[PDB]
Design a protein around this ligand. Sequence first.
Ligand SMILES: O=C(NC(=O)c1cccc2ccccc12)N[C@@H]1O[C@H](CO)[C@@H](O)[C@H](O)[C@H]1O
Ligand SMILES: O=C(NC(=O)c1cccc2ccccc12)N[C@@H]1O[C@H](CO)[C@@H](O)[C@H](O)[C@H]1O
Ligand SMILES: O=c1[nH]cnc2c1ncn2[C@@H]1O[C@H](COP(=O)(O)O)[C@@H](O)[C@H]1O
Ligand SMILES: O=c1[nH]cnc2c1ncn2[C@@H]1O[C@H](COP(=O)(O)O)[C@@H](O)[C@H]1O
Ligand SMILES: *Cc1c(COP(=O)(O)O)cnc(C)c1O
Ligand SMILES: *Cc1c(COP(=O)(O)O)cnc(C)c1O
Lengths: 807, 807
Amino acid sequence: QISVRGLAGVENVTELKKNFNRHLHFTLVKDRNVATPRDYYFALAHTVRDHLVGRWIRTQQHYYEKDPKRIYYLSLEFYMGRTLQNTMVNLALENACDEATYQLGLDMEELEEIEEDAGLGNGGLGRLAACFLDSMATLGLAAYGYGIRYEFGIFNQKICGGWQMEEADDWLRYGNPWEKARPEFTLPVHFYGRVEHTSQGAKWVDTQVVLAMPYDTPVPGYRNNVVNTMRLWSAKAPNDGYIQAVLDRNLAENISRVLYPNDNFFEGKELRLKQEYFVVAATLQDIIRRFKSSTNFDAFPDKVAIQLNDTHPSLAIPELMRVLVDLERLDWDKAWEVTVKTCAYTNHTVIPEALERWPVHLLETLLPRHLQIIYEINQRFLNRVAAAFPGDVDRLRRMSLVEEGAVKRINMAHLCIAGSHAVNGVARIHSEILKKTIFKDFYELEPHKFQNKTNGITPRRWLVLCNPGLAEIIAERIGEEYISDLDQLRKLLSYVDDEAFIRDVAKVKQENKLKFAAYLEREYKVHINPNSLFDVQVKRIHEYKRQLLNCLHVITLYNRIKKEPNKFVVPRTVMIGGKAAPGYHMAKMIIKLITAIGDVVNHDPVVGDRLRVIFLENYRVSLAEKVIPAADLSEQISTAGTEASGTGNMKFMLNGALTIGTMDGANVEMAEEAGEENFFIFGMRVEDVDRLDQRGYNAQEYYDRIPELRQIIEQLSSGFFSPKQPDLFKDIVNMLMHHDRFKVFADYEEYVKCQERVSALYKNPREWTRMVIRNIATSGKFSSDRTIAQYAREIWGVEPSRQRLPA
Amino acid sequence: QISVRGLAGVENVTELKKNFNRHLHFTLVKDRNVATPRDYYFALAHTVRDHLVGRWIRTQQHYYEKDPKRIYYLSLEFYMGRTLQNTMVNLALENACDEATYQLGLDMEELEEIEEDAGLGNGGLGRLAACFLDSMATLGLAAYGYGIRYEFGIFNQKICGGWQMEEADDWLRYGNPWEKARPEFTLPVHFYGRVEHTSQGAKWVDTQVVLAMPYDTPVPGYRNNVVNTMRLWSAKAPNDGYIQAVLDRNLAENISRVLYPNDNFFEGKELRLKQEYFVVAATLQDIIRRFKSSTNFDAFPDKVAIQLNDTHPSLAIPELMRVLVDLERLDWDKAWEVTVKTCAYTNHTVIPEALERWPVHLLETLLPRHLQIIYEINQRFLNRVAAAFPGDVDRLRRMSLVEEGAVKRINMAHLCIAGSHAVNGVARIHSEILKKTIFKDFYELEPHKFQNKTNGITPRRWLVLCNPGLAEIIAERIGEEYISDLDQLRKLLSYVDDEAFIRDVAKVKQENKLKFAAYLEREYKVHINPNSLFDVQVKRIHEYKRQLLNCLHVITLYNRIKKEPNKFVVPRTVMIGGKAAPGYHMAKMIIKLITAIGDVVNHDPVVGDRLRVIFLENYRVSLAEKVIPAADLSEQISTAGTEASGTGNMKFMLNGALTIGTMDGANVEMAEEAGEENFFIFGMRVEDVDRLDQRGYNAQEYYDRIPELRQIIEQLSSGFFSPKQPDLFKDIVNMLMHHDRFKVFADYEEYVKCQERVSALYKNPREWTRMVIRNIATSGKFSSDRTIAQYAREIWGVEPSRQRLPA
Ligand SMILES: O=C(NC(=O)c1cccc2ccccc12)N[C@@H]1O[C@H](CO)[C@@H](O)[C@H](O)[C@H]1O
Ligand SMILES: O=C(NC(=O)c1cccc2ccccc12)N[C@@H]1O[C@H](CO)[C@@H](O)[C@H](O)[C@H]1O
Ligand SMILES: O=c1[nH]cnc2c1ncn2[C@@H]1O[C@H](COP(=O)(O)O)[C@@H](O)[C@H]1O
Ligand SMILES: O=c1[nH]cnc2c1ncn2[C@@H]1O[C@H](COP(=O)(O)O)[C@@H](O)[C@H]1O
Ligand SMILES: *Cc1c(COP(=O)(O)O)cnc(C)c1O
Ligand SMILES: *Cc1c(COP(=O)(O)O)cnc(C)c1O
């Protein structure tokens, strides 16, 4: 049906049909008489998987032969989503499989919905790693993703009486056809023990052993026949009352059991530290083995790059030192040179409570050799600081890897800067803030280390896969080459005055909204007006992301309607979705508020279908692929200086939504690319937030001066949105009035006024769509292909290539 | 090469080769350049598995269509061993796969050794279930094996300094190609809670739910295209700090973690009770579902038979009652009629410490509704006893299901007799003892219930598979039909004076001994003389099995050699192997003694290669398949009245070894079949043991009267076999002298004299082999095909059939 979905050749369709029937019979052991939709999904998945295998084997064989520099991307999170459609897209199999399944009397779309998300991440950081894997494969890099195979990913979110409930994400229950267990490549990982000093160096002895078993998942590039590997480690007990000893094996295997869902506050939990070391120790053994098959470690940095996604895998730095010094017998200075040239570190937030600061007593017990190595790193680093800034004693305490106090801690961010040749932020404004504030001292010592790499998203998943209608109307005009060269979307500016294209763009959006409106009716008991403005804020629930500011506007619109019922207002469907960390009380209260607002607003007869507030349950990659194509307005309203980049913002821009946002993270670069006139910018800049911090933020001032704001707070306090429990939202009110770190009130007025300008433009469909075209056309910078090309050239020292392997 | 191994057709060989290469590439994701022997094993296993699938689907479809009476064999143990060779044998694929692999440059024998045993049983009871599955499939019965998929089977046994060490049997590490997970058929199982009495009957509420996930394994019949199912349940937690709750899922999943290895003493452990109910509750839901697809429960016993392997699944009786009464709303009397007609119970030991007697307080907490049902069963049963034997108050307390005392217990054996239409022992002498002693009262009340079903072994695994050389020389003379009709071996009596056959029989044995002698050298550091008499006792270590009596003879032979070094004695290799239950101190001491004897005997220069004592490490099904074909003498020396049947005894008889044994278990019937002159019978009969118990067993008497016995005990006491720890064996000596339940000394003299007659005959190779032929020729009764045919006709009410399905 759709040209970008590839050719449906008669031989290809015939072959897929027979291999589908083969797997149903031999692989699933099912007859057609009792087969269910799930069985049919698995037969299709196995059929598509077969097409990956030949390419996977020859790609990996090709790397062994040519011995290029290898890129190791270390992350505790890979937020992969579903794999079936992505695989079909990247192999040019989508139309063929669609035909083959139709001929067997099946709907492929229905089968696609059966696949569980691989939800092995929390949000943006996890999803960035996933987009990065796709781009590295598309750009022909010899890249490996390394992480943990969590048995349970991010929890499934149920909403019960307006409250978030958490449910185990048993994503492996029915099996994972995409992975291949490699028990033959199991490696030992050591914990605890003690350090022994011999005449012939230090020795780590009396350790407990946990085994790391790898599972490999293929990562196909876009139509280039490159298939890279994501290797995820699973924890296993070694084989050596009897019953109790066997049952206690669970203690070791708990390491890979569950993804930590806390994305707001650093908790120094021992199990988390074990997870971090587990991935690091197993991965580094693999890296070294693969390098030794190419032993002089001078060439190590020429053959290996290690990228640390946040400080989570920071133990890579002292682990590499441990192996080089203790096991390979290299002298300290040489090992350090190798380590620094090999490692690079990416930061994802300036928020202080997010920094990993591990208690010394924990490292002492768990990793005694690593603590000794960290101390030595610190001493040598501080000697260099002292020589560069003589007599500056305050600098020495500020830059130390060891933090003093009631409990001594290791600052893992400081460790990462010292042990890496490159440190990057994830958007221009973020990287600047790093140099000006949190890492200022480090920048003054080693300016050359600090870089920017503005984030991106893969246009395969985030356009072609989730929005085929838009991909097609674009391809009709400019061809298919933009899919792997997103800059070509600029050519669409020549169609901004084209009446046919304007109509098509608006048509694709309407079709997307109808489809999502129906989806909401089918799987939930909610009806929405598809003619209304789809106002969408989807992301993890955090105070800094200011879902609360959105909530205030919603109540403002409601109150205005109650004030002047017979006045025309642009109809809106306000959709807010996202998970809250299980221990984050305030975020759980915000979810409750959103549903409570909905309960009042959605049932007021005076409102009608002019305003609807829906909380989107269980927001995850697969839901993002559904809602983002349907959005008219993208809410990106974090307090200036708090959202390092954002990536959701980029997804909306590529999919035909306009953006209301602060000048924060990548929003700044987005507005720069599209033009400020084509963006709905509001609120304080970073500098304005700084000035307000100087004199001190007083929320009472805004409450006193803005009558519409006052009414809302009084409504919250009196129990208007909670009649049975009048004081339910007292915590929220208290926070807003007395200790709001994120200055919700300070941006309220400008936010509301900006929202009026949005409504004004939506009344003129032609001008809305023309602005939309201007956004889509300039979204090319935000391809992760661009991002990865910059990492490759400026950090890893490798050249990307669009050249196809023979298959 | 071998005719019984089937045809190697050119098309079949070509097809197997290409499917082997297909699986290596697509299934294992390996190139030939890095493939290991293990990879090659898996590719072969998947290729052979494909040939099962079509037959498996159509067999199960055939049962759905024809709706025959279904046989459900419930066991907590299925001691399956390896599956690859058995599958090839039963599908007539062995020669074809041998050719196909040879042409690819591989040795199939080497690949076969890579497969892990499925060691989901302890010994005889577990192995009986496995032989029974094979025979039921071969006889065309609609039979299902139901059990638990233990993550860890029977422990691997390491011998360290002469002591047994236990190691986890991680048999699933590399995956199990034979099983198919069926997560779609997961069923709930309830624990704890309380009983609520409503107007509309009893209700079991507030329970904890554990999920039962089935895994199906195919069971191929011998060349009849029948493939039955073994369904094994795996425990899973339902999906509903956050981290802790996820980690605590292990508590539920512990139910299927490990096989209980205690085969000597009943321990009322809660986890064991949970295992027993788990298998029962999940299985019964399956049985009922399948029956409802054929709701009047009058026909239930006409469509369902449930066989209880020991009392381990005895909870089937009150569970069936629970479902019929509480859920289906049948009146008590009707439900009871159905239950009794459906269930049958097999007993495996008369030893009192083996009886399952569950504390009432445990059942009260865990299964409160079942305890109520058990009480009601007991009351109604005791009312019947009272009516049949009025005024016999002693009978009432003896027959009660409830046992009185400091702690109240439920006798599960009494429950099984009350709730079953048939109760059987496993050999004629055993079944008689049941009627005369332990179940006398029950036999007087319901004589019709009590039956004998003499055990058997499958001649597929225990002749064709493990001893192809013997299978071939037999087939040359009488054809191939004996393999599924073992009675035909009687035709071999006409060859007892045939010089060619005598030579062939002796040749096959010599070749088997050379092969096993080499195996011992290759995988261990032990050399043996292949010309010596191979004297073998392999079985679990128990006091009743009297490995200690064997030990006394070995020391006797050693002492005689030291006394008269220059006198000729028939050279012997004495092999003893078997695992001891981890908590069984005495059995662990016996293993230590055996190795300690070896340390002295094997290193005495005066002895030479005339006597060797070897402990066979890690005895298990795969090792049994190697050692049994190599044996000359089979030691079956339990105290008369203690070994219910034995099955190892039958394996040796079929494989060309002569038997030294007591008149115990199936030994009696074996000697009856072969002729007493062709058996080495010694020792007390049951009646003699009884008489000795009357006057009281005094071991001191034998010590005083037998100088050779006295010398041995003094050697043990003084530290002759343990110079560093002189008192190491004081526990053994103390037991032998003062509290030996099994009367080791009483049989010593007759045992030693009998062993001299064995040595005498071995000096005459021609007459040895003629006696061997007389044994093999009369071993037909001991086929499990015969056993299963008797169960089918006399208990289950179904007719067996050798008729082949179309494939
Ligand atoms: O998702 C992020 N962090 C986590 O999920 C996270 C994961 C684990 C622990 C955390 C502790 C504190 C704060 C966050 C986490 N960070 C996001 O990274 C994206 C990719 O660079 C950025 O676009 C986004 O601004 C940032 O918040
Ligand atoms: O193996 C047996 N029992 C167990 O493994 C066993 C399994 C579990 C618990 C036990 C408790 C006490 C005694 C034995 C067990 N019994 C054997 O059953 C065979 C098959 O009928 C007989 O040939 C043999 O005589 C009997 O000992
Ligand atoms: O020793 C070797 N000889 C030939 N090829 C090898 C060897 N080692 C690795 N390879 C190839 O490199 C691929 C990936 O190796 P890995 O990166 O070490 O897992 C393998 O699948 C082989 O195709
Ligand atoms: O509802 C049905 N319609 C047609 N065949 C069925 C149906 N239910 C079961 N079967 C057949 O019976 C086989 C085994 O069913 P089970 O014994 O219930 O697992 C299935 O594989 C099918 O071939
Ligand atoms: C893109 C994405 C995110 C990141 O969104 P931000 O608005 O940048 O925080 C979080 N979760 C999912 C499922 C995503 O796809
Ligand atoms: C046959 C068998 C047994 C039973 O042997 P008995 O001598 O009858 O106790 C025990 N273990 C294995 C592995 C067997 O094959």
